[PDB]
Amino acid sequence: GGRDLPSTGFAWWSGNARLINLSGKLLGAHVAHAGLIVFWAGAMTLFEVAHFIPEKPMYEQGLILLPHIATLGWGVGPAGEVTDIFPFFVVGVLHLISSAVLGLGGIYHALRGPEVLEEYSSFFGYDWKDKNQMTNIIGYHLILLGCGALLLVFKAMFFGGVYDTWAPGGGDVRVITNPTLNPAIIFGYLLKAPFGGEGWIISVNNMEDIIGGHIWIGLICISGGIWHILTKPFGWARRALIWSGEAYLSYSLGALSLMGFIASVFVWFNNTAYPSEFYGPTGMEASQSQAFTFLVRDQRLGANIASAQGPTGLGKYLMRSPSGEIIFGGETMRFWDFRGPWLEPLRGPNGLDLDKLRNDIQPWQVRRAAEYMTHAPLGSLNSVGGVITDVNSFNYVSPRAWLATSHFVLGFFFLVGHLWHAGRARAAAAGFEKGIDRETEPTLFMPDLD
Amino acid sequence: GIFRFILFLQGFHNWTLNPFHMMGVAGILGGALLCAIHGATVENTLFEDGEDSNTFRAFEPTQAEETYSMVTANRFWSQIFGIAFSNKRWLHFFMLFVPVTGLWMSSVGIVGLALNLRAYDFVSQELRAAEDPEFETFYTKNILLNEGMRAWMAPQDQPHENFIFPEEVLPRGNAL
Amino acid sequence: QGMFVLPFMARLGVTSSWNGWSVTGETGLDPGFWSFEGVAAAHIVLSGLLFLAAVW
Amino acid sequence: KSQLTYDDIVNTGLANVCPEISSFTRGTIEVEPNTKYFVSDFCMEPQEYFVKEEPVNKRQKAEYVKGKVLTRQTTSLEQIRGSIAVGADGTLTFKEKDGIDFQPITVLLPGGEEVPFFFTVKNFTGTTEPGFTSINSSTDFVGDFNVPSYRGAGFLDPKARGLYTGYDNAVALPSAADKFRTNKKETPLGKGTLSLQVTQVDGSTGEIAGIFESEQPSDTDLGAKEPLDVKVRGIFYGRVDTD
Amino acid sequence: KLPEAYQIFDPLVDVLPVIPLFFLALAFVWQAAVGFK
Amino acid sequence: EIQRRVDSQLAEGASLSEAWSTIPEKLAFYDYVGNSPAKGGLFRTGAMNSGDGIAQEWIGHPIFKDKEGRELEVRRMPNFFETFPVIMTDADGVVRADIPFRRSESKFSVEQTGVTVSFYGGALDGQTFSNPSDVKKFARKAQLGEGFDFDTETFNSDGVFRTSPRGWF
Amino acid sequence: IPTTYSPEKIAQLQVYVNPIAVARDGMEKRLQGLIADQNWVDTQTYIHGPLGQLRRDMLGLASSLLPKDQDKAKTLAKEVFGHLERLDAAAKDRNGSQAKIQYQEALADFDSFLNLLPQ
Amino acid sequence: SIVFQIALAALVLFSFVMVVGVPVAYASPQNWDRSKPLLYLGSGIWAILVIVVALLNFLV
Amino acid sequence: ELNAVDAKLTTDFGQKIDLNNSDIRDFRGLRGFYPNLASEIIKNAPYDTVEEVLDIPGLSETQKSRLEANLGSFTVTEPSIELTSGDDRINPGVY
Numbered sequence A: 001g002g003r004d005l006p007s008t009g010f011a012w013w014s015g016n017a018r019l020i021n022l023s024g025k026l027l028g029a030h031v032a033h034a035g036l037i038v039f040w041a042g043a044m045t046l047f048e049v050a051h052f053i054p055e056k057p058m059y060e061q062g063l064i065l066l067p068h069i070a071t072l073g074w075g076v077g078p079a080g081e082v083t084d085i086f087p088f089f090v091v092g093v094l095h096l097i098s099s100a101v102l103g104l105g106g107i108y109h110a111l112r113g114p115e116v117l118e119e120y121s122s123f124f125g126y127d128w129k130d131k132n133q134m135t136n137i138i139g140y141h142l143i144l145l146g147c148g149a150l151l152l153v154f155k156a157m158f159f160g161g162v163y164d165t166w167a168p169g170g171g172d173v174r175v176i177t178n179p180t181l182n183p184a185i186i187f188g189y190l191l192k193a194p195f196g197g198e199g200w201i202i203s204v205n206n207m208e209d210i211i212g213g214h215i216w217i218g219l220i221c222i223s224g225g226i227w228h229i230l231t232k233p234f235g236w237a238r239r240a241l242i243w244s245g246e247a248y249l250s251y252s253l254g255a256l257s258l259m260g261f262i263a264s265v266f267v268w269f270n271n272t273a274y275p276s277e278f279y280g281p282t283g284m285e286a287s288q289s290q291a292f293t294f295l296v297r298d299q300r301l302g303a304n305i306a307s308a309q310g311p312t313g314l315g316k317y318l319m320r321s322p323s324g325e326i327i328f329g330g331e332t333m334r335f336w337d338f339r340g341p342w343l344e345p346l347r348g349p350n351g352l353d354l355d356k357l358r359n360d361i362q363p364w365q366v367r368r369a370a371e372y373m374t375h376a377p378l379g380s381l382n383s384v385g386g387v388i389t390d391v392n393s394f395n396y397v398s399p400r401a402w403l404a405t406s407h408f409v410l411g412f413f414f415l416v417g418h419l420w421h422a423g424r425a426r427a428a429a430a431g432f433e434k435g436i437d438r439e440t441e442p443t444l445f446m447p448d449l450d
Numbered sequence B: 001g002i003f004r005f006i007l008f009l010q011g012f013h014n015w016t017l018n019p020f021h022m023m024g025v026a027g028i029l030g031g032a033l034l035c036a037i038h039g040a041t042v043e044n045t046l047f048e049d050g051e052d053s054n055t056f057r058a059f060e061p062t063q064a065e066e067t068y069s070m071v072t073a074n075r076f077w078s079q080i081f082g083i084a085f086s087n088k089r090w091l092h093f094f095m096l097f098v099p100v101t102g103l104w105m106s107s108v109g110i111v112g113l114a115l116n117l118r119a120y121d122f123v124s125q126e127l128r129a130a131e132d133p134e135f136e137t138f139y140t141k142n143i144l145l146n147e148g149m150r151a152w153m154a155p156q157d158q159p160h161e162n163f164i165f166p167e168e169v170l171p172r173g174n175a176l
Numbered sequence C: 001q002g003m004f005v006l007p008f009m010a011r012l013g014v015t016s017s018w019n020g021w022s023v024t025g026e027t028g029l030d031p032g033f034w035s036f037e038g039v040a041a042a043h044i045v046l047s048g049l050l051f052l053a054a055v056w
Numbered sequence D: 001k002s003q004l005t006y007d008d009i010v011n012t013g014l015a016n017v018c019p020e021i022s023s024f025t026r027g028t029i030e031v032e033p034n035t036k037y038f039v040s041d042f043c044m045e046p047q048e049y050f051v052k053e054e055p056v057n058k059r060q061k062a063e064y065v066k067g068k069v070l071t072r073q074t075t076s077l078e079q080i081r082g083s084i085a086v087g088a089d090g091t092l093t094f095k096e097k098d099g100i101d102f103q104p105i106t107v108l109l110p111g112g113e114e115v116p117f118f119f120t121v122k123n124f125t126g127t128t129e130p131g132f133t134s135i136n137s138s139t140d141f142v143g144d145f146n147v148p149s150y151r152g153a154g155f156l157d158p159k160a161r162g163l164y165t166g167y168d169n170a171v172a173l174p175s176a177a178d179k180f181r182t183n184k185k186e187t188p189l190g191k192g193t194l195s196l197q198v199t200q201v202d203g204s205t206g207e208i209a210g211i212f213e214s215e216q217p218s219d220t221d222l223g224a225k226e227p228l229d230v231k232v233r234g235i236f237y238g239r240v241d242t243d
Numbered sequence E: 001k002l003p004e005a006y007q008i009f010d011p012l013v014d015v016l017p018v019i020p021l022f023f024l025a026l027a028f029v030w031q032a033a034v035g036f037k
Numbered sequence F: 001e002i003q004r005r006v007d008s009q010l011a012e013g014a015s016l017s018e019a020w021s022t023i024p025e026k027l028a029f030y031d032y033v034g035n036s037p038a039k040g041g042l043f044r045t046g047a048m049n050s051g052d053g054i055a056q057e058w059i060g061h062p063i064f065k066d067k068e069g070r071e072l073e074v075r076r077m078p079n080f081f082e083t084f085p086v087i088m089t090d091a092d093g094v095v096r097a098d099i100p101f102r103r104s105e106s107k108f109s110v111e112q113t114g115v116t117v118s119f120y121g122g123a124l125d126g127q128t129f130s131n132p133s134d135v136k137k138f139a140r141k142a143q144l145g146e147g148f149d150f151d152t153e154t155f156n157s158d159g160v161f162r163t164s165p166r167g168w169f
Numbered sequence G: 001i002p003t004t005y006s007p008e009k010i011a012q013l014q015v016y017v018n019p020i021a022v023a024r025d026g027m028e029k030r031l032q033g034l035i036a037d038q039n040w041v042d043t044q045t046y047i048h049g050p051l052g053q054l055r056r057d058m059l060g061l062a063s064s065l066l067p068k069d070q071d072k073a074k075t076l077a078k079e080v081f082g083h084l085e086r087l088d089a090a091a092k093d094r095n096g097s098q099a100k101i102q103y104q105e106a107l108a109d110f111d112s113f114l115n116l117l118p119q
Numbered sequence H: 001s002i003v004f005q006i007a008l009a010a011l012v013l014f015s016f017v018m019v020v021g022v023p024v025a026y027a028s029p030q031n032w033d034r035s036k037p038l039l040y041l042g043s044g045i046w047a048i049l050v051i052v053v054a055l056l057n058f059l060v
Numbered sequence I: 001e002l003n004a005v006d007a008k009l010t011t012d013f014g015q016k017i018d019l020n021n022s023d024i025r026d027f028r029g030l031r032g033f034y035p036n037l038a039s040e041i042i043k044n045a046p047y048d049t050v051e052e053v054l055d056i057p058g059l060s061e062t063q064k065s066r067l068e069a070n071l072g073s074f075t076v077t078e079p080s081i082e083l084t085s086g087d088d089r090i091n092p093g094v095y
């Protein structure tokens, strides 16, 4: 294929578009880029390990990868205390070396390997219009994805377990012996409203549900992989979809935008797959923690926190949710759907329980609430912690803030890319992506509007 | 420094409430809108004048013919938005007119503020709130915000005045 | 109170509001949609539809 | 709320419902002549709200009007602790001690007036007639309770006027600042009357349920206007510790 | 931090993660060498 | 200028009341912030009498004393401020009294510091006020400069200042 | 590797021995009756509340113990936690019999764990 | 213990020489006769160095 | 017209620590008071005279001595519910 504008029709700034029909070069680009991803995983892990002070919390040190490893149950014990630093190092080293291998392969295919693969092999050669081959590649990758989900399941069940922040006796790494395979729970998660108090799938709150849903995901992905290997797209799919490389790219871009938004919300709200031990409190958690901290302090001072009415007439410390549940008062009324391992022991069937509040509060809960209140996910861009009017002496931005902001931004720009490529794929399939033909300008053959 | 000037004008002059500033905002946002929409409309109604996917080199500065279809653009915007430009000359004069008039109107408002001739208050709502302690609007809330800004900002912003506002005279809500 | 059209609604049986009051001096009555407000809104919508038919 | 969990209870409105005892219940709770018994989890669930409208004519019957609650299922007192003492003659004295013993409630009346009031049972001491050697279906605790100001003295009105905080004048009108009567905020301690008709006693477990009717003033908005008369009818439940 | 045996390459791991930014820049270097064909 | 005239009167041997009574009401009226052209609003229309009202008479010059005899000066409202906190300073520029916004940690209020005001010249000549409500009212007046009795009924004046013909021109 | 109790090492154990003894006392007193009263909400609240540091404290007993007793104490604490988890499971499903079984299991393993306690 | 340090420094040096040489060798079709065996040898030696580093990790 | 709190600031309440109306932060100046003795005092209000603060039931000998030592700082005024309702003596919304 050509490597300039005259021979390709694409400028340098759209040079990767020149690869659309060079399957070998495209494969090289993909493999090298995968090498970039794995390289970042390894290098960032080693950086985080090197810059890790293991007696300080992870979320106080700007770490986003080490929490992922800790959640999987590696190198941590009860309450998230880092037992062994070596497994983090091993994850990083393995990713770095494998990235070397992937980069070598991507360079080979991009620079010297065969330009196209179709006259080399039918198995690896593909045509974008070859619907059966495209569904074959879908099938292979679906099988792989289901296998990866089952790898998560195997780690949680047979290889030491995963970190369970809801464990009795304290959050700890525990082995999940009874995943919920019950499809009612698993698929009723997908039907929950994406609004406050329901939290469509962000509300999954126990590792049994997570592991069981991953068993279901693995089975679904593998069976769909086989289904796509053994069939071709049906008539309705053929009549509804654009069948081109750019169209498939646009479809994947839409999917990725959806996943990016979901991940940003997930890290912002969920404290089960993102234990606060490693990611710090959620904003909801920190607000509730402040309310709890001052309930505890004022109660020790002698305030009768059940009957103390605030300035507006609502309870200063306790109040009712619009459905009647007893909740913390103040602005944190909006966060009454929050559930956390440190707060549920004080919750009764009706909400917060006066008897537990008056005699069941443990010193570790007070310490945890103070920590979470002071590590609220508020911070400046230059990493000054606290409310924006605070002064420069607290260097902290929550990992939840970093992850949520970054992935909302990436989700948005991938929605933009999906719009761009979907529109372009449609126009190119219909053949007017290069502009209006003067001879057959469609609007010239149309009746005037009025 | 400019940010300080901006917040100063909000707190002391209630500059957002000023109709001349609102016409300025309308002009600037409309100018940005016109820029974006015109650029996109032209780029997406281009004539097929070359063979490259790169449409940028299918234009020649000395060419006599339009490079994009005004008719198609007009039909598109008539059906999408209800109305559309049909005169190119009026379109470009409008692109000049909108932001320039916005700037001129905002300048008139600033001239007013030079003499403290502000659009600070709505007297009817002030009187009602003074006699009715349950009347609350976003306007009155903004008035409260301005009071807070002035009291907390003046001692540092105007050091030559030697403003000494003891902690107890500072307005503030509960718990904050 | 200088009420001109209200008596004409009340004459034919529309005597209650959405605010719970009724011109018979009663309160808490439920008129349904055919309150004073409902009748007025129906007339406004009718006016719009008639305008459109006139244009056509 | 029966005997569920919070997962079963959340977002249902059951959290705002006082428990009920049973149907086949006509027991009585024996009491000693001069000992006092703790009340464990006292609940009051209002169901009807009436505001005494004020005629402009004069001298004419005011006729309580039925209101509707604009605030949601946030209207119930619960987890209240108290005590019942048996007088020398046989009097039964119910004394509220603490708990979630207040809820702000806003009711809408026909005409568009919204009436916030501080529904409460605070410091309620109520008594029966003498000669009660038992708590039964005839036990009527009629008494008084305190009604604090709806808005506390830390509240600020839309012009940042308040009692122990805020301005004391209309600052937006510099030449007429001290002219407005609402420049002075007030928090009078209003008074209420309550009756607690016990209708159902399960002496085995000590739970008592019944009906209540309460009379109390509404919000004055820190003395901005005269309080209306609000009447609340509802039901109640509590456990009486026999031992 | 890094296990003790590895802390002589601590100032190397400090700069490793930023390399893919250099790859993105290198794309432009390569296109500039070929005259942005 | 007013202070200079009063000081000359005193330097002869006039008492406070006589010296301040030598001040013409016209000069005192010039010394009043409601007559500054930088106090109006773009849509506060009409005559300045439509604002504070028609001025009737000068109330005389207030002199604020706290419980300890310190003479206090009320800080005047600048042209910039639509509203301004009430602050009283003594001779060496130390805040000695104010009107607190929050009272639970109040230290310098008119109530705690025992500030009293006596008037010289004008309508209130020779009278002294110790009720903190009156003292606070007169301190708020003193923020605006010389105090004046106003007829607010004739124009149904609204209470917010207007600009002068100087400002409108 | 002293492999012998001494006056000063006992004081360093004591800082964790106190909360664990309090937890065992509570497990004998309150949690048993909570299970007996068929009170699942309070069973779960107790095991997640006052017990919400039991793992940390008993791994403090184990990790800071004798070279013979370190691994044994660790394993015993782990078995206690497993019984605690199965207790939580039997409470969430209102399994009174299984919960009583697990409570006896946790008590027996806790007593075995405190058995290898000097003094 | 110094042997591990030496091996890891050698591995970093060989990673640098591979990172330089590999793209040049893959993008010089004229000198592919003598750079393909050099690529094979270099990949083998790089893998050997990685294996040695891994073993000396547990040996040190 | 002063509302009611400013009228209290006219009294001895605005000059020293009122045992019936002062917030618990107001006791921090007295060494050894906040928070325990201060909370005990606020719990056992009202007091008709300053002297009955020494008659707090269950008081302690060191607390007795501290109260006697700081008797001078104390006053007793009528307990105004403006300052008292809602547990504002414990938390008046000031941090």
Ligand code: CLA
Residues within 6 Å of the ligand: A012, A013, A014, A015, A016, A017, A249, A253, A413, A414, A415, A416, A417, A418, A420, A424, B053, E021
């Ligand atoms: C997997 C995702 C994906 C893939 C494979 C492609 C692939 C392609 N895109 Mg595309 N795109 C995407 C996502 C993707 N896109 C998203 C998310 C957007 C929204 C922004 C777009 C918007 C877009 C446009 C407008 C165009 C393409 C085009 C193309 C084609 C050529 C592009 C090229 O040569 O690169 C060249 C690379 C550059 C010129 C460098 C760009 C650098 C960016 C702008 C900034 C990088 C910021 C990054 C975060 C790092 C910050 C650095 C900081 C430290 C300073 C190509 C097939 C072109 C096309 O349509 O072909 C027919 C084209 O016109 N895309």
Ligand code: CLA
Residues within 6 Å of the ligand: A001, A002, A003, A004, A011, A012, A013, A014, A015, A016, A017, A018, A019, A022, A025, A026, A028, A029, A030, A032, A033, A100, A103, A104, A107, A110, A111, E024, E027, E028, E030, E031, H018, H019, H020, H022, H023, H027
């Ligand atoms: C992930 C990023 C990425 C990847 C994988 C690719 C990949 C590719 N691009 Mg491309 N491109 C990119 C970003 C990327 N691009 C950006 C951001 C721009 C805008 C500036 C472009 C603009 C562009 C244009 C205009 C063209 C391409 C083309 C190509 C293809 C041919 C490569 C070539 O011959 O050049 C040769 C370059 C060299 C020989 C220099 C050395 C390159 C090597 C790989 C450097 C590796 C260094 C590494 C550290 C060494 C480690 C080795 C090992 C030990 C691990 C190829 C598959 C061409 C094409 O489409 O072919 C038909 C083409 O004409 N691109």
Ligand code: CLA
Residues within 6 Å of the ligand: A027, A031, A101, A102, A103, A104, A105, A106, A108, A113, A114, A117, A124, A125
């Ligand atoms: C998805 C990634 C991918 C894909 C689709 C391909 C595809 C292809 N490669 Mg390539 N390659 C890759 C990555 C990839 N490669 C990487 C990372 C490297 C660096 C090591 C290479 C280095 C390479 C060289 C040097 C050559 C190719 C060649 C080829 C072509 C012939 C394949 C063949 O029949 O040989 C046989 C395939 C097998 C015997 C199957 C072995 C499968 C692997 C090696 C075992 C591991 C399987 C693993 C468990 C599955 C999951 C992987 C795991 C990481 C998750 C073919 C189109 C050849 C070519 O182009 O012909 C002229 C060629 O000479 N590749």
Ligand code: CLA
Residues within 6 Å of the ligand: A138, A142, A190, A191, A220, A221, A222, A223, A224, A225, A227, A228, A231, A232, A233, A234, A237
């Ligand atoms: C990445 C994975 C992947 C990809 C790319 C595909 C791609 C495809 N599949 Mg599929 N499939 C998969 C995984 C995948 N599959 C798995 C894991 C299974 C096993 C369950 C299946 C089982 C399956 C079947 C039975 C069929 C396909 C078919 C198809 C083809 C057309 C279907 C279509 O238009 O999609 C889009 C879907 C629609 C247009 C229907 C509308 C669905 C609703 C109305 C949209 C609402 C979504 C909502 C907004 C999102 C909320 C999330 C949640 C709450 C629901 C297409 C090429 C069809 C085919 O042609 O087979 C050869 C077909 O019959 N697949």
Ligand code: CLA
Residues within 6 Å of the ligand: C005, C006, C007, C008, C009, C012, C014, C039, C040, C046
């Ligand atoms: C279904 C349609 C409908 C309905 C249910 C109503 C209902 C109502 N209208 Mg309304 N209106 C309508 C359509 C409708 N309107 C239309 C299309 C117009 C525009 C012309 C109006 C304009 C209108 C006005 C201006 C007013 C109303 C008013 C009212 C309210 C009282 C009406 C009244 O007093 O009757 C009076 C009707 C008559 C007395 C009819 C007289 C017809 C004469 C006597 C017959 C003519 C001779 C005959 C044909 C020959 C002999 C035949 C015989 C032998 C059979 C009432 C709620 C009043 C109101 O309350 O305001 C909110 C009001 O003032 N309407």
Ligand code: CLA
Residues within 6 Å of the ligand: B101, F042, F043, F044, F045, F046, F047, F164, F165, F168, F169
């Ligand atoms: C520069 C000339 C000038 C000046 C300085 C004044 C000044 C004054 N006049 Mg006056 N007057 C004038 C000309 C002037 N007048 C003219 C030409 C007439 C004949 C109509 C009058 C008739 C008049 C009357 C009847 C009265 C006055 C009064 C007054 C006094 C009150 C001022 C006031 O509130 O106005 C208010 C000013 C505003 C509210 C500003 C209005 C700004 C408008 C809305 C701008 C329009 C925006 C525009 C549409 C934007 C264009 C859009 C863009 C696309 C181009 C004041 C001293 C009053 C008085 O007190 O008399 C004793 C009074 O009763 N005047």
Ligand SMILES: CC1=C(/C=C/C(C)=C/C=C/C(C)=C/C=C/C=C(C)/C=C/C=C(C)/C=C/C2=C(C)CCCC2(C)C)C(C)(C)CCC1
Residues within 6 Å of the ligand: C044, C045, C046, C047, C048, C049, C051, C052
């Ligand atoms: C002056 C005078 C007179 C006269 C009067 C008249 C004649 C008038 C009138 C009047 C009128 C005659 C009025 C009216 C009106 C109206 C209205 C007010 C309307 C409306 C409407 C609407 C709003 C609609 C809308 C719509 C549309 C448009 C379409 C679609 C549908 C809708 C609904 C949306 C007389 C003689 C008596 C005498 C005295 C004086």
Ligand SMILES: [Ca+2]
Residues within 6 Å of the ligand: A050, E010, E011, E013, E014
């Ligand atoms: Ca380093």
Ligand SMILES: [Ca+2]
Residues within 6 Å of the ligand: F104, F105, I022, I023, I025, I026
């Ligand atoms: Ca205080």
